[PDB]
Amino acid sequence: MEIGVPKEIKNQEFRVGLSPSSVRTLVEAGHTVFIETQAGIGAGFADQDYVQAGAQVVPSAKDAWSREMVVKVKEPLPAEYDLMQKDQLLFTYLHLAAARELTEQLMRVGLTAIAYETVELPNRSLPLLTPMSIIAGRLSVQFGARFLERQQGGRGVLLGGVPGVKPGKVVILGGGVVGTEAAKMAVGLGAQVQIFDINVERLSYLETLFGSRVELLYSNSAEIETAVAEADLLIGAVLVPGRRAPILVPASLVEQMRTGSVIVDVAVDQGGCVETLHPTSHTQPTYEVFGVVHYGVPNMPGAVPWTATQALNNSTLPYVVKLANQGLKALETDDALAKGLNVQAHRLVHPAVQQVFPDLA
Amino acid sequence: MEIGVPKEIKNQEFRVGLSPSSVRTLVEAGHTVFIETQAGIGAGFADQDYVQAGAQVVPSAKDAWSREMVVKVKEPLPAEYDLMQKDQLLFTYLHLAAARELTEQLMRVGLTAIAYETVELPNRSLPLLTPMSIIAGRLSVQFGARFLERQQGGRGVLLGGVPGVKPGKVVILGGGVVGTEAAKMAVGLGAQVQIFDINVERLSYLETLFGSRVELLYSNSAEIETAVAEADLLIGAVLVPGRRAPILVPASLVEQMRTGSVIVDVAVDQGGCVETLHPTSHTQPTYEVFGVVHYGVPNMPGAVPWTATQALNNSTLPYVVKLANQGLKALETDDALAKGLNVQAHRLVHPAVQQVFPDLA
Amino acid sequence: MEIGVPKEIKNQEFRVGLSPSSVRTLVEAGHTVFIETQAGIGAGFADQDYVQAGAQVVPSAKDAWSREMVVKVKEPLPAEYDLMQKDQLLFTYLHLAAARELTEQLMRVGLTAIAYETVELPNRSLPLLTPMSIIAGRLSVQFGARFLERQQGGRGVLLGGVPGVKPGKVVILGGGVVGTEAAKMAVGLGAQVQIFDINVERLSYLETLFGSRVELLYSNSAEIETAVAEADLLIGAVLVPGRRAPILVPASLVEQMRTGSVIVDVAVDQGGCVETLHPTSHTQPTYEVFGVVHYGVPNMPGAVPWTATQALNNSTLPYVVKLANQGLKALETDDALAKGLNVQAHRLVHPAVQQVFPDLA
Amino acid sequence: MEIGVPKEIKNQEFRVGLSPSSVRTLVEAGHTVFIETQAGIGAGFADQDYVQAGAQVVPSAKDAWSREMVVKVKEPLPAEYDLMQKDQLLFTYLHLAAARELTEQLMRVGLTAIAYETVELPNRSLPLLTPMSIIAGRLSVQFGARFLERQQGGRGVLLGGVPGVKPGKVVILGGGVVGTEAAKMAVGLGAQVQIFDINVERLSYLETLFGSRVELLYSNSAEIETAVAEADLLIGAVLVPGRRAPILVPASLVEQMRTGSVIVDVAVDQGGCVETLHPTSHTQPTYEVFGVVHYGVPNMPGAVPWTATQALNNSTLPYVVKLANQGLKALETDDALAKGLNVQAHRLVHPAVQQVFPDLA
Amino acid sequence: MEIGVPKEIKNQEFRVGLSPSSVRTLVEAGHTVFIETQAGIGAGFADQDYVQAGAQVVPSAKDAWSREMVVKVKEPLPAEYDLMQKDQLLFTYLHLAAARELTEQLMRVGLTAIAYETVELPNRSLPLLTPMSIIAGRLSVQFGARFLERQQGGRGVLLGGVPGVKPGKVVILGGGVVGTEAAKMAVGLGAQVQIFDINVERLSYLETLFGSRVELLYSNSAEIETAVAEADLLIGAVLVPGRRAPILVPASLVEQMRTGSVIVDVAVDQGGCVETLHPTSHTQPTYEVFGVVHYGVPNMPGAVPWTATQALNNSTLPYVVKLANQGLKALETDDALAKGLNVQAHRLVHPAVQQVFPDLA
């Protein structure tokens, strides 16, 4: 089939729908791929890299959008509304429950739109989100370290300390994928680490990963208050993937933290467990409240497009290939894919999105 | 004795001569300490913290400089020239071989000036520099990670990668203290690590620290060329503490690196092993050459004043106390201290500095 | 019941159906065991060892075959065809889908034949093969090391290297049981290790075992080509247990490897992922193609009969006992056992074998 | 030579001068050994064990003391004063600076007495004490755990905690051999561990042992106060081997500890760094002060005589053999041994003991 | 709802039904809690601690029992029979299959009694027992170490040994939760460890925890005999949670052990795998048989009430809250809870208990 890859135009988005390795695989399966020139450049893939893989490099977005299958990272933007076509297959991150107009837009056109974030397994795991969650957990500590530096606003604490000097204290709220990846990085830098979670089974599993190197604590208000008050870096890792997390950290608690301490909440764009934290922009990524630095820039994985693009592709790939092969039938052969279907033939098919736009159903 | 601690006035210097814990110890020995208000604030120590320790908090630098012993971090600046007094003991980092005027200045006044950086052990180890070297090694990786981020200029590579994706490659030139601390952090983030050194004994010792987790390679031009060409992060850790390092990395080699790769050289302000690297300012910390990001801001430990101040104090402390107790006699009881003596009674006593200002001798 | 254990007569087969410890357990359950003298000797078990356990040591194979249950390692050979009896229970590795005559033979006689390799759990795991797979993964590295030695044909590379010198590079294709056991040994010798697999979940699980010590890469043609070209030891660990694996390594790729590199494919006797690799004999275990050493001797676990016999028994034991107790009813109490049934009462019962000899059904 | 080994008669002393393995070695060198029946029994060595080694088992102490060389663990007691002979070589732990009468006693008789505890190397290391120090460090945590149990008096805290629950906090004062061995055990049980020491080099070395798993802190009054106040188990490991340690822990600090916390000071019989701690008896090993349990039974290694006897012998052995071979000349061939000499020919030769009994010199 | 917490009156029981943190959570949910003064004291929780959490501290047990919900640790004792009320919800460890009278008693009164130990998941896991099992595994080694000390009765062996001396040998029978936690502690002390189990899958899983540090052996009589004969510490960890374990260790085997060896069987109060072992009292916790020390005090977790109370609460908490909220309906919303129901409205509802008191049904 013909597959097109337009350049991402969303602000600060540097990832790309398909990497050169992915292209090569698709091509080896008899498919042909068209990629807009410069599409991979922000992720470190030059057009030649695409050429060696078997892609035809196209000079314009129009040329990339005019294909039977469009594989992207972000949702289409208004500027691209007129590039979409009736019988297309669109595969990318959509987040329709937050975009009425886009939803309507896709409905008008008639194409079938499959969202990465809804492709779901029997376990109710979302295989196409996880890669990004892992990266976000790892970056949280990298960012946090940077903001604990004096010139960046923090108290000027080295996470690992040095022999003879106290190491930094990292408190992680949430013991899932994100919190686990964050603990790995924090332990790697030599920090003292505490992870809180309400699921003892999870706490038990974590002990098999970390042994006695990390403190594994049950999430109760009492212990949370004490820990947080002593934290240099507090990481919110309760990513409740539909609706918002409860407040585990109220402003009153934030007021009790040391000046120069830093807070990072991976759940920022969805709603965090930290009362005081809201989204920020790249130009002004942090702000203070009670002398405590808040970092609220969303989509952390966008900072490492080379790594993120491959991680995503490693997971989307098998789906892209199925779609390329079986076209629409793949949705009847693949339950996960079937679950990813959001819009088709002008109808809004996704149950969760209907629930949001009940009058759109 | 009376000991004064003025606030550091050098630009971007946030450390302080004595921490509250140090003060407390000095006070418990019968000594009295005067500290300029706000002196500890950049390092996270409030005046009250000094008060609880036994210090008298002074409103002005004059009040801090007017003491028998002045304990600082950086060298005195012109602005402070008129605050110095004839019979003072001055203990701080001086670096006289780079400051004719300061040297002359100290000579005029007549005080005795002891430099942290020359206090030397029989082993020719410099116990008062090491703490900073350790911190610098650890920060090199923290900074390097930040600059590999796309928005910061790098190719956008996550050092640790994610299962299924290549981790970042960190190449470290120099297997001493600095390079060893850097390898610890890089391994902690999950990177693939190579350390080069010309001393096999050192390489052997490093294997006892890292086992087979890190590649331990003899420094030969041939291997260096290959490694460097594949590096995401290259760290120069050849800190030859008097005079400059040889070029291990010529521009021709830099031209061979991938675009978005990053270079950090801990030896920048003294002269690195990387041809293309020069010092930069805080306002413009990096620059590109061949698409390779160069970070050249010096004094990395200044980014973590809370941690750095304690680390320094842990080492200077026993010397400060000796001086406070025995005053000038300590130089006849302590050989290391004796070696730290740079200027006294208008004479330039330091052999290495004489060699620099042979007409000053 | 009476259970007999004949000596294995297949060439180079040194294992034995039951070890002394197993015998002892069977005897303690009221069963009586007859073992042909010297049967255990190749595995390091002397007849006395069998005597102390409660076995009656028999002077001839006839005496061992004349029992209600025969427990063996390999399939019966023609020489033994006349030793089999009508109402016997035979339990051993059969591999009928490769032996028409044996299959017919067992059909003529009428005995019931249970194959180790088809006893299957609900998970479709084959509990009686796994023990051998684990051993094979571990040996792959042991053999590979031996063939990288100059006198053995390889380039003469020490896997672990020595501080200052590059370690060997081991590339493992397949992240399942076999590949995982191989990585354990390779890491143990100090090699640089890469594992490729197409299942990210598996890659993720592997990270919990190895942390960042091993490179965990998604199997894509592009990455495979690069890795393999740099390998000292390439290990094929894609054991697709029914039908053959796809070629992950074509001759063209082999031609790109360094001279003296070595290839070991655990899937050799079934069909490997390496184009150029075929089975070899003990007398001439390897051959070169493009200066690359190929090792193709099958049944690697046969090299360590002492270890292999116990490993097998630890798994077969509970089944042997059930059979001894409940005789044929055990097949109605045990689903796994039921699945192991291949031939009974002259009929070919195994669905997969029927499919092979559709006219035998 | 003839060597005798009397049974230790000191209360609660179960160790023995020579183990069976040692005997065997001595015998293989042409020497003959006489051991009092039951001498090894408290350490787990029966007379037969001595017989198989080549010893002649003697029925009485008299028979053991009547030899040219007497090898013991503890100092001779009054009861044995009349068993000593004029030209004997006595080798055991003496501690003369604490026993005027014993000293006089040995002077009267005229024998030559070599003390284990003074045999000294050029490094001023005491090779024959170290084995016991290592054991004492390891036991400190074992005892401490037992006293944190509710029925034993402590608050009832499990050192390692369980996933979801806070682990115990162990604070160790002193980073030498003893403190290091204690940290090893505490980390092994899963506790949170802090080690304090005033030597940064030592702290640095400790990081090579423990990585970031243990907190390595410079000993300053301020940090000490905080840490100790939060401790479940405080271990005094400042063993200043001649004269007493300074008080690092004053009663005022002890009053600040939690009720049920436990203190163990390895320096008890010499003088600890904990104000409130004094020696206790086996019958009443602990006592409370401020609700804090104090354990003050000395000679911890006596609890594991089997392990302690071998550890000691491994170190004394080469000396015993030298003495057996060269008799008194060994003191002119061995400087360490020469330093072990305390009394000879009625004269008190040991410089440090003279200093104690200046009128004995 | 009103929830009462009486003080545990069973002998040597120091735990408490709810900790202060738990109280605080319950109170934050609108519930009110009454706790008998001194109830938490044995676990280290003072009444004030309960006051700060929101509890009303009651002066008498009567006042604590007079509530709609009673949350305890142990079963009610006769002394409390008259404190129980008709419509109460009772939640604690009951063990009715061992107490006819208690069972009858609860039947008379009419309350609904939910047993911690029967609340069961679909997996047939008993989430409210596990916490105690983990603690018991960890303590087994702590106790065992204490009894290997000479003064305590053992041969006087240090588990970890010292460099140059044999470490202790710990043999663990059973590779489940208990045996696994025990191995963790034994390895932590430096002992040589062997774990036996009959489930190879479990053995395989254990290798992922311990690597090659521990010997993982299949449980067969032959290997068991050898291992046990060489053991310093034998730990019975076959906790078959309904009915008794088989004898893995017969007296004949015990007679073969070394004198001073120690045996601990976690299954003592239910029936162990060690023939010779029976329960003992706190006043006389051990006894010898063949010179082998037997420790038979039950309920090991009672030794660490502070740790045990929290561990238990972390698991019971979510159930306590459900009950407080939904009262009896929770049994129709929660299957696990439903399974915990033992007695209600005068009827004996628990299937397993009926089976025991078939005439009680």
UniProtKB/TrEMBL annotation, chains A, B, C, D, E:
Is Repeat included in the keywords of this UniProt record? no
Residues reported to bind substrate:
15, 74
Q: Name one GO cellular component term.
A: plasma membrane
The alphabetized list of GO BP terms reads: L-alanine catabolic process
Occurrences of domain Alanine dehydrogenase/pyridine nucleotide transhydrogenase NAD(H)-binding (ranges): 148-296
**Which amino acid positions bind NAD(+), per UniProt?**
133, 177-178, 197, 202, 219, 238-239, 266-269, 297-300
Q: Which reaction does it catalyse?
A: L-alanine + NAD(+) + H2O = pyruvate + NH4(+) + NADH + H(+)
Q: What is its EC number?
A: 1.4.1.1
Active site (record annotation): 95 (proton donor/acceptor), 269 (proton donor/acceptor)
- What positions are marked as the site Activator? 15, 74
Which residues are noted in the entry as pyruvate-binding? 15, 74, 95
Name the pathway. Answer: Amino-acid degradation; L-alanine degradation via dehydrogenase pathway; NH(3) and pyruvate from L-alanine: step 1/1
Quote the SUPFAM superfamilies the UniProt record gives: Formate/glycerate dehydrogenase catalytic domain-like (SSF52283), NAD(P)-binding Rossmann-fold domains (SSF51735)
InterPro entries, from UniProt?
Ala_DH (IPR008141), Ala_DH/PNT_CS2 (IPR008143), AlaDH/PNT_N (IPR007886), AlaDH/PNT_NAD(H)-bd (IPR007698), NAD(P)-bd_dom_sf (IPR036291)
Q: Which UniProt keywords apply?
A: NAD, Nucleotide-binding, Oxidoreductase
**Residues annotated as domain Alanine dehydrogenase/pyridine nucleotide transhydrogenase N-terminal:** 4-136
A molecular-function term among this protein's GO annotations:
nucleotide binding
Q: Which family does it belong to?
A: Belongs to the AlaDH/PNT family.
Q: What is this protein called?
A: Alanine dehydrogenase
Can you name the source organism?
Phormidium lapideum
Gene symbol?
ald
